[PDB]
Amino acid sequence: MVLSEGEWQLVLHVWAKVEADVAGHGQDILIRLFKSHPETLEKFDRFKHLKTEAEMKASEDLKKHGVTILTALGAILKKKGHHEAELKPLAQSHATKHKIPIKYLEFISEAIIHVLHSRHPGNFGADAQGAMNKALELFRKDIAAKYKELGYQG
Ligand code: HEM
């Protein structure tokens, strides 16, 4: 898949807004993911004991990790499709060390789109959401292809 420059502009326009508060968006996203799909929490050995959203909101650790995730995703989106080098080390740790199925990447894709829709309605109308969805589908397709080369699958 290939996004047009107009689509990348809609994606980087709303991402510039997310970058005004990276830690808050990171938090929102991970909590949304853990509440919606609680099975995903079991993958994190560092955060699986968290019982409630209040506990999640108060974890400093969880918040730092949300900044780590979003910084890594933001550096990929800014490449505008030329992200091969960035994807390599991310695909190798998530397929070999963390063991994250593609289905979970779909779940966090959904969580991103939910949070952007709630925090940025004006910059996340239907065309912008379609371009963000296209950018994350591209990311999942490329990561699934790398998963295959690395030997992870199902
Ligand atoms: C937008 C998609 C994602 C991005 C960009 C992302 C990125 C990261 C980054 C940069 C790290 C630290 C470096 C490394 O271990 O590779 C990381 C660690 C990790 N990731 Fe992801 N990730 C994504 C989705 C997920 C999903 C969906 C799960 C599980 C449901 C997951 C589980 C983990 C685990 C278990 C760690 C280790 C956390 C800790 O250090 O203990 N990741 N991820």
Principal-axis shape equals globular
Largest sheet: none
Strand % is under 5%
Strand/helix succession: HHHHHHH
Number of domains: 1
Overall CATH class: Mainly Alpha
Q: What's the end-to-end separation, in Å? A: 23 Å
Count the E strands.
Answer: 0
The structure class reads mainly alpha
Structure description:
Belongs to the globin family. Pfam families: Globin. Monomeric. Keywords: Cytoplasm, Heme, Iron, Metal-binding, Muscle protein, Oxidoreductase, Oxygen transport, Phosphoprotein, Transport. The radius of gyration is 15 Å and the shape is globular. It has one domain: Orthogonal Bundle (Globin-like). It has about 150 residues and is mainly α. It has seven helices and no strands. The structure holds protoporphyrin IX containing FE (HEM).
Please supply descriptive tags for the structure shown above:
7 helices; metal-binding; binds protoporphyrin IX containing FE; nitrite reductase activity; 154 residues; monomer; peroxidase activity; globular; 0% strand; Globin-like; EC 1.7.-.-
Could you give a quick summary of the protein structure above?
It contains seven helices and no strands.
Secondary structure layout:
Layout lengths: L4 H14 L3 H15 L16 H6 L1 H18 L6 H15 L3 H18 L6 H25 L4
Helix pairs in contact: 1-7, 2-4, 2-6, 5-7, 6-7
The chain binds protoporphyrin IX containing FE.
